[PDB]
Amino acid sequence: VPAFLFSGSTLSSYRPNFITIALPHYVNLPGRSNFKLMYIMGFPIDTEMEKDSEYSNKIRQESKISKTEGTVCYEQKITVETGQEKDGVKVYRVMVLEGTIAESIEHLDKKENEDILNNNRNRIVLADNTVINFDNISQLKEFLRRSVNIVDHDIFSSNGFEGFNPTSHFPSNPSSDYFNSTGVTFGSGVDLGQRSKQDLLNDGVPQYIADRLDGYYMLRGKEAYDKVRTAPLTLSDNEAHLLSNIYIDKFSHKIEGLFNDANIGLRFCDLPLRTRTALVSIGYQKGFKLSRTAPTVWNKVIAKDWNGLVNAFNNIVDGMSDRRKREGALVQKDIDSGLLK
């Protein structure tokens, strides 16, 4: 123990020095201190011990981030290690050294690395030098999977929020006030009334999906309405999710920028997933500039008053109040889960 130590492969953008490796080689990983690595064979080894040492790191603090419900900011590179620890002595093989989330997921999916990952303790060493210890490799991968998404797309397309309808639909009638502004709609509120095919292509929507919507583009009011009654179109769930997610993500990035531009002492990626989801949902419904479209929400966000933020969602009556309560409950969950406070 640790087992299969030199097996598999290791992902590092950093490949030290410039013969002669069967000898241990030591180096300080450049950006940070301490990060002390001991290279044996071609492989990086992270060791920690309580007692002072010249070649070992000091014991690292455990991150407060939840291994079960938590995420790491999607803008961070991470270090992934697998290994063993006892009695103030820690020895970890570095599987991924300061790589991106997506790279990490990819690398850990490699068959060659199975043995070492299944046979040891897996942990993430964060940019902040704290660590998250996982019960098992499957847990770590799922954590990573959560972390890569800006919003939780399943919640978003749940009936509780934006819903999901793969069939072309017109969510208005000739009597209603929004009739002329409503277009042919797909998935989780993707309205083509102001969008053209080229627009969708530009946003990264696949040609095969885009080609299908021909005739549904740019129709608004009567024409869009009529078109759905006369010639509806049903997408497969897969195509409708793909399309929705492009727009959910596109919109999310709008919300993200506002938050980050506010310079509030943290970035949007540092918020828990559900809260990001909450913020984006209300934006998607009420308009993206929350300073204007949801001031009472916005105030609490930028104040980092999480309890205050929940209350704010509960206290808005736009006639949308049910969804707003569901948004606040997302925030409250993060509170109850310890992701917030």
TrEMBL record:
It comes from the Bacteria. Keywords: Antimicrobial, Bacteriolytic enzyme, Plasmid. Signal peptide: none annotated. One of its GO terms (biological process) is defense response to bacterium. Residues 5-136 form the Pesticin translocation and receptor binding domain. Transmembrane segments: none annotated. This is Pesticin. It comes from Yersinia pestis.
